[PDB]
């Protein structure tokens, strides 16, 4: 209230003006009469990019390579996500490096475009933030220029690379050149010297000689004085390889267009075959390559798009899966890896390891870079330039910011209080925090663990390496609040306070006694002031990072019989605005009907549909990384044959108005993973007579569909 506060008292002056207007809601705030209103946040702001110090590349929708964005990296907290389960068995010593260039391999493109799910990767990467990028080249914490391989995501601006996977850049290569060496030559040595056991003078057959791993394989083999046969797509690749390696004549090149190389290699080797086969092609070329093997020859298959029968072989231990072995070695970093580290390190000194060709792409062109690798229209490495290399050779990395999308993260060394978190949304929210970094939770309840579902998930968290303490204490007195935070500071600095408590009593306002009225006013008023007070006083105030107070739509929509719950829920919404006046952190989600978890779980109330919890947590992530106090979130419930199938097909893609979107934009552009296409494929037959191919689905426009059903 301004210097002249209103004087509303019976026969006052300011009151008489209000009576004449006769408005149902008059609030005097910031010196003006007004009303509390819910202003819609545009959908474009949910993905708005803001400056951020630490970022990493991920995908908004899995299987779409046009949805790669830069998100906030939990490395701002020092550590990295995915420190649960197996990842806690290997206590590798890591060096925090500033990434200057990130190398792009065919492994990243395979994961990004949905050809392989992240579950095929090593189990230590199951809970990682992202799975894109392994190699990099930058500066370590001491300013030295380094390059190496680290568990993903190395497609970021800061990495925590194990000290046993980090090489030193010679003082002749720019940081740009060093970004091409590590993985290409690390895999070449693994395929030849570690798995193939190549020997001096042996004959080796390399598929896809022009690829980055193909070029590295040739260089290693030539250093071993081998007889080389390589498959080159076109004459440009053959010419390129000849220029890079003068020892190669036209006699060492074949064609990948058909399996005619078998006779050539089987005549030039005089029927002995090839000692080592680095195999990337599949189908009949795989069979022909096997038939070229000598009697002691080794077949190293590093292709990614394996068939179904050969995928069964991997499961039943019939064959070894070598297409994700470099990733597995980097997790363990045991004797097998140190052999490759020594080999590559030796190669650098002896001149075998030489930088490959390169093609730098800016950070914002990540989508274009990924498409370039997938097409394979030309040879060379694709490297994303994160920063600009300084002229000096040992200098600190300047502190800069990058545009990235929000991603909430919790400090692993800080304890988080979840008051009333042992129920409904609390347990499935604590699961979310654990996956996003939280490793110290204090769940509070009035009774304790009282159901089998609670005991199961609390046991699940403890198994993952989280420290959970369950207190049966209601915070309705300063003494209890001290006890709860005492058990908190003994686990770590208090870095979050969430209140998800509710005690509902429903009845008509006239039939409610005093005791019945103040039932929902203990977890929403009495608590929130005692938790607020603690966060305002040290040592929590300096340490506190989040302060979340869950609320309901009764504050903005109202309800019948819940006059008490409305009163308490609003006071919680105003205690969370006093915090904003004083600059303290505060968040207050104002939910609507929610599904799968709680009160509603046990549908349509006030015409609003219940939300799916996997959305509750998607918007909740937006809520935490925002400047407003309360963010209202709710869901509202919603001819010719040619238009019939169009609506059904458009509905599959997640489009509400088929006519709104462009009729010339291909389905893959909007996004068609692997299940939407089959649904459309079976729907174009169920609804009409059309029978289309799965691949044809993703490259056909809406106009094509309309013009095809008529035919």
């Amino acid at each position: 209230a301004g210097p002249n506060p209103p004087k509303i008292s019976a026969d006052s002056a300011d009151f008489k003006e209000l009576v004449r207007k006769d408005l149902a809601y008059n609030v005097f705030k910031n010196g003006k009469w007004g009303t509390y209103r819910g202003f819609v946040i545009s959908d474009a702001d949910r993905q708005k990019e803001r400056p951020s110090e630490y970022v990493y590349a991920d995908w908004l929708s899995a299987g779409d390579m046009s949805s790669l964005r830069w998100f906030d990296s939990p490395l701002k907290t020092g550590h990295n996500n995915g420190m649960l389960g197996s990842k806690m068995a290997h206590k590798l010593e890591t060096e925090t490096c500033s990434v200057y260039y990130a190398g792009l391999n065919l492994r990243d493109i395979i994961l990004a475009n949905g050809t392989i799910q992240r579950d095929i990767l090593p189990e230590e990467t199951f809970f990682k933030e992202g799975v894109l990028g392994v190699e990099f080249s930058g500066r370590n914490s001491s300013g030295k220029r380094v390059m190496g391989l680290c568990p993903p995501p190395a497609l970021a601006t800061t990495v925590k690379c194990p000290v046993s996977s980090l090489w030193s850049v010679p003082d002749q290569w720019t940081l740009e050149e060093a970004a091409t060496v590590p993985l290409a030559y690390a895999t070449a040595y693994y395929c030849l010297v570690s798995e193939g056991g190549v020997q001096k003078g042996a004959t080796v057959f390399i598929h896809a000689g022009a690829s980055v791993v193909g070029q590295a394989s040739i260089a290693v083999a030539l250093s071993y004085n081998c007889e080389i046969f390589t498959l080159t797509k076109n004459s440009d690749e053959t010419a390129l390889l000849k220029s890079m390696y003068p020892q190669l004549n036209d006699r060492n090149f074949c064609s990948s267009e058909d399996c005619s190389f078998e006779k050539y290699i089987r005549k030039e080797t005089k029927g002995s075959g090839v000692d080592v086969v680095i195999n990337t092609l599949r189908g009949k070329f795989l069979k022909a390559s096997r038939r070229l093997l000598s009697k002691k020859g080794k077949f190293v298959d590093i292709g990614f798009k394996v068939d179904s029968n050969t995928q069964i072989a991997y499961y039943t231990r019939e064959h070894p899966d070598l297409r994700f072995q470099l990733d597995a070695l980097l997790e363990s970093q045991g004797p097998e890896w140190t052999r490759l580290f020594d080999l590559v390190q030796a190669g650098i000194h002896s001149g075998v390891v030489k930088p490959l060709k390169r093609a730098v792409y800016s950070m914002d062109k990540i989508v274009d870079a990924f498409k370039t690798v997938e097409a394979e229209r030309e040879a060379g490495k694709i490297v994303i330039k994160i920063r600009d290399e300084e002229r000096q050779k040992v200098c600190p990395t300047p502190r800069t910011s990058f545009p990235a999308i929000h991603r909430t993260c919790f400090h692993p060394d800080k304890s988080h209080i979840l008051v009333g978190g042992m129920g409904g949304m609390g347990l499935e929210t604590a699961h979310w925090m654990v996956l996003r970094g939280a490793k110290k939770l204090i769940l509070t309840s009035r009774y304790g663990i009282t159901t089998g579902y609670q005991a199961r998930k609390i046991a699940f968290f403890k198994q993952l390496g989280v420290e959970v303490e369950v207190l049966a204490l209601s915070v309705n007195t300063r003494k209890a609040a001290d006890k709860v935070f005492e058990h908190a500071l003994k686990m770590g600095p208090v870095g979050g306070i969430f209140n998800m408590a509710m005690v509902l009593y429903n009845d008509d306002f006239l039939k409610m006694n005093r005791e019945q009225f103040l039932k929902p006013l203990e977890s929403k008023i009495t608590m929130t002031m005692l938790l607020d007070d603690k966060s305002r006083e040290k040592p929590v105030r300096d340490t506190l990072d989040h302060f979340v107070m869950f609320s309901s739509l009764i504050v903005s929509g109202g309800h019948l019989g819940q006059a008490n719950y409305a009163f308490g829920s609003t006071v919680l919404e105003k205690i969370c605005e006093r915090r904003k006046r004083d600059g303290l952190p505060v968040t207050t989600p104002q939910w609507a009907s929610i599904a799968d978890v709680g009160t509603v779980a046990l549908t349509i109330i006030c015409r609003k549909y219940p939300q799916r919890f996997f959305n509750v947590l998607s918007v909740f992530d937006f809520m935490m990384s925002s400047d407003n106090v309360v963010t209202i979130s709710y869901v509202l419930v919603e001819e010719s044959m040619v238009d019939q199938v169009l609506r059904a097909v458009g509905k599959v893609l997640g489009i509400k108005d088929v006519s709104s979107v462009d009729g010339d934009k291909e389905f893959i552009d909007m996004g068609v993973d692997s299940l939407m296409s089959v649904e459309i494929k079976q729907a174009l037959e169920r609804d009409a007579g059309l029978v289309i191919s799965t691949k044809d689905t993703q490259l056909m426009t809406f106009n094509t569909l309309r013009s095809m059903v008529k035919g």
Partner: protein
């Protein structure tokens, strides 16, 4: 070529329960659905009654998903090779399942679970037991919308090992409830669709016969998940080494509106 099966998803068809099995609004044909179709086809080839035949499927790949059409009819064309046993469920020119099915007259069951009588989950407190409500809260949060016919597991332990699967006569639902012991053995937050069951044995001669017609208090068969061998067994059924493929979650409603109370 061989037996063609017509799944009638009408208002009162006996196979109307197949619609009470959806994954985030997608009404898919159960992965164990193709097991019964292949199992019944082999019996029809042999001339014996499918409930008197002890089978064993191997490497059952669910090549592609079958979207059941509500209030309609779907057709499949199961085909079993006489001597080798290669079975194949298909719809037109599209493959939907594959594998090898073999019958035998001897013991086909590895784990000795068909002998267990009662239930280990007796006398335990309520805070050391999961019930039907809580088991299918775990599945629902992961995207698996099970209805009332597929909600078989009546009780379980916090370890997910012991269960009280219900036997009510329907085979497509029973084999799915045995495959639910696998899903709740891998706690998580993502949605996984099974795509390869390496071994399935459905010896019915050690399995309780169909409930007497008119029954409503269906009996419960003790089940167990073997974390060592990766075997889910209950009564006269075992499923070993079942693998799944992660799938993105679909929003059945429309995007929420976010406002700023100010």
């Amino acid at each position: 070529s061989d037996n063609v099966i017509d799944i009638d998803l009408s208002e009162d068809s006996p196979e109307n329960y197949l619609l009470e099995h959806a994954v985030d609004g997608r009404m898919l044909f159960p992965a164990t659905g193709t097991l019964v179709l292949a199992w019944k086809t082999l019996a029809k080839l042999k001339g014996v009654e499918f409930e008197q035949l002890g089978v064993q499927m191997t490497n059952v790949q669910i090549h592609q998903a079958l979207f059941l059409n509500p209030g309609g009819k779907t057709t499949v064309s199961v085909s079993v090779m006489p001597i080798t046993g290669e079975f194949q469920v298909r719809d037109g020119e599209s493959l939907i399942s594959s594998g090898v099915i073999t019958s035998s007259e001897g013991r086909l069951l590895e784990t000795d679970q068909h002998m267990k009588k009662g239930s280990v989950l007796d006398g335990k407190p309520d805070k050391e037991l999961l019930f039907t409500k809580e088991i299918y809260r775990e599945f629902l949060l992961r995207g698996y919308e099970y209805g009332a016919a597929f909600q078989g597991i009546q009780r379980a332990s916090l370890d997910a090992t012991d269960t009280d699967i219900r036997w009510d006569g329907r085979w497509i639902s029973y084999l799915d409830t045995v495959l639910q012991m696998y899903l709740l053995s891998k706690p998580g937050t993502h949605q996984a669709l099974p795509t390869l069951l390496e071994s399935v044995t459905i010896d019915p001669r050690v399995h309780p016969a169909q409930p007497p017609e008119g029954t409503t208090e269906f009996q419960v068969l003790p089940g167990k998940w073997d974390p060592v061998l990766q075997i889910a067994a209950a009564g006269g059924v075992e499923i070993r080494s079942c693998h799944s493929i992660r799938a993105s979650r679909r929003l059945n409603h429309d995007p929420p509106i976010l406002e700023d109370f100010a």
